[PDB]
Amino acid sequence: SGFRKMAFPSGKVEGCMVQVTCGTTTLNGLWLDDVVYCPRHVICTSEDMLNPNYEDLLIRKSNHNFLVQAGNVQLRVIGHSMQNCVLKLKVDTANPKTPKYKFVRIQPGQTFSVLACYNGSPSGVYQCAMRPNFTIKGSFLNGSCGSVGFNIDYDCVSFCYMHHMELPTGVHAGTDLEGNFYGPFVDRQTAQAAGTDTTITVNVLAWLYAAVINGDRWFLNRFTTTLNDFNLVAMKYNYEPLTQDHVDILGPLSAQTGIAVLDMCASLKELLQNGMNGRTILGSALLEDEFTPFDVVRQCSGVTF
Amino acid sequence: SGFRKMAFPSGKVEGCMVQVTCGTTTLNGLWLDDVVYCPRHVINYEDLLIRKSNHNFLVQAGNVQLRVIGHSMQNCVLKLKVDTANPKTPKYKFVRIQPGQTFSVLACYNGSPSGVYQCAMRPNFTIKGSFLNGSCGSVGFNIDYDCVSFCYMHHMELPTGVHAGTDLEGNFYGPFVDRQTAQAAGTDTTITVNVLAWLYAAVINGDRWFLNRFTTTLNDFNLVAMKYNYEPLTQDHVDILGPLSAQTGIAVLDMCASLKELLQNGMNGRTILGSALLEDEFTPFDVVRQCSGVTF
Ligand SMILES: O=C(Cc1cccc(Cl)c1)Nc1cncc2ccccc12
Ligand SMILES: [Cl-]
Secondary structure (H helix, E strand, O other), rough: OOOOOEEOOOOHHOOEEEEEEEOHHHHEEEOOEEEEEEEHHHHHOOHHOOOOHHHHHHOOOOHHHEEEEEEEEEEEEEEEEEEEOEEEEEEEEOOOOOEEEEEOOOOOEEEEEEEEEOOOOEEEEEEEOOOOOOOOOOOOOOOOOOOOOEEEEOOOEEEEEEEEEOOOOOEEEEHHHHHEEEEOOOOOOOOOOOOOOOOOOOHHHHHHHHHHHOOOOOOOOOOOHHHHHHHHHHHHHHOOOOOOHHHHOOHHHHHOOOOOOOHHHHHHHHHHOOOOOOEEEOOOOOOOHHHHHHHEEHHOOOOOO | OOOOOOOOOHHHHOOEEOOOOOOOOEEEEEEEEOOOEEEEEOOHHHHHHHOOOOHHEEEEEEEEEEEEEEEEEEEEEEEEOOOOOOOOEEEEEEEOOOOOEEEEEEEEEEOEEEEEEEOOOOOOOEOOOOOOOOOOOEEEEEEEEEEEEEEEEEEEOOOOOEEEEOOOOOOOOOOOOOOOOOOOOOOOEEOHHHHHHHHHHHHHHOOOOOOOOOOOOHHHHHHHHHHHOOOOOOOHHHHOHHHHHHHHHHHHHHHHHHHHHHHHHOOOOOOOOEOOOOOOOOOHHHHHOOOOOOOO
């Protein structure tokens, strides 16, 4: 019993964190095999950040300008190349702690663990989700760039995010491990703002099913709804549209608890209308949207209370 | 910017998790040097122990079987002497924590780590964790510099879904016993010094709507705190909140008047750090650490 925001064990990622220094800038890098991956903005000055020409800045650099430190050992850079917004530094030594890994690009609503780092040293681990506006609500200070987001289903580490910047509202933007940004963001100091954010509907439903599994049903009602009527209501509360894919994905949780997806949808509609009336659901007074259907199945018991 | 419930990096602890099997029971063990520590309920525990031999305890570290060469009990923890010292043993200490203190939990099943989360020792000595069958032996810890301080080992779940366990010397936190008997968690209270620390974290991150011009005495604040099931605030708590008070410019008793108004009036449809409840699982040290970037 119980339901916590749970992160994956971070050890496999800790053994990959290194410090990358170029001129005055110091940030984090990800050392896998003989390559160190880091944000390309490590070659910029703060002035350069308005309209940087990365190709022009990179051609002026040599291998010895990049200082890479793994613990107390200085690694030797023997090559460099740019792939989208990521810099790939070829080093003379392969990481003996390299785990089994993949580079995966995730979709909004997906969750992952973040190992926040400073100076190539891990400081903390937390769980979070890719928001519908492609930003993440992280906890990052100056020096955190290059920190990575990942999942470890089975024993393979799936890298999905690398931290690049903080937007004016305090939210964070970054790329997949191939250097492609999530969202319409650029690694430029230009007028950029996160779009209006919405609630991840399929995740709130998954979390309502987790509450039923943990023995709570106060929020349920005798009603049902069509998918269309639910979406007309949900969009008035800034909730993401629920698709037939989302309904299919909630199938196993529906079969385990005995509550049809459109019946759980009717309960969500009523919660949005009435509020919680001094009650909580899994120790929360708000409707939680950072647990996917997959997260609920992984953490919760296979036997409903 | 941002404020998350953050756990310590778990790598140093992952390299210590093993599976312990005795008869029908399978649970987790902590392998440090040549000893495996696990809950004694894996087996009158002295009468139960005398009947077991070394070869009855099967210990597995990854895909390698460890040979048990000795066994002894210390309070509610079983110590299994093994033939091999853990090469991944980090620098460590066994520490007993107080209610209100926080720690990270590496939840394990079959000696394999599955997740990490942050939590606090409640004033009623239980923890609001997330555990299923197979999780016994999972450990709680903090990291200070490069030294792991082990503070908790999981033993059981109470009827309300909350958890109970011991320090690494086998002494239970709370008035609990390791046996299937009528046991219930006592009435819990809110950790006042932690709510204040979290209010300071919100001010540091730009949430100032709850601030007011008023102040209070420590005595008047405690009379109000007793009414809402909040733990008493001591002069030690006031001194501990000193640095956060100097950084934000809000005196501890000035922040207490904000907390008094929040208890009597509610939040009025507003949130603080994305929460509609007053959060009590961040200590003053956790707030300073997350708003400074200390690494390990
Ligand atoms: O935003 C940046 C650097 C930058 C600037 C402009 C464009 C780009 Cl691509 C990168 N750093 C930080 C990343 N996370 C959190 C931060 C919190 C405070 C200060 C800086 C923080
Ligand atoms: Cl995805």
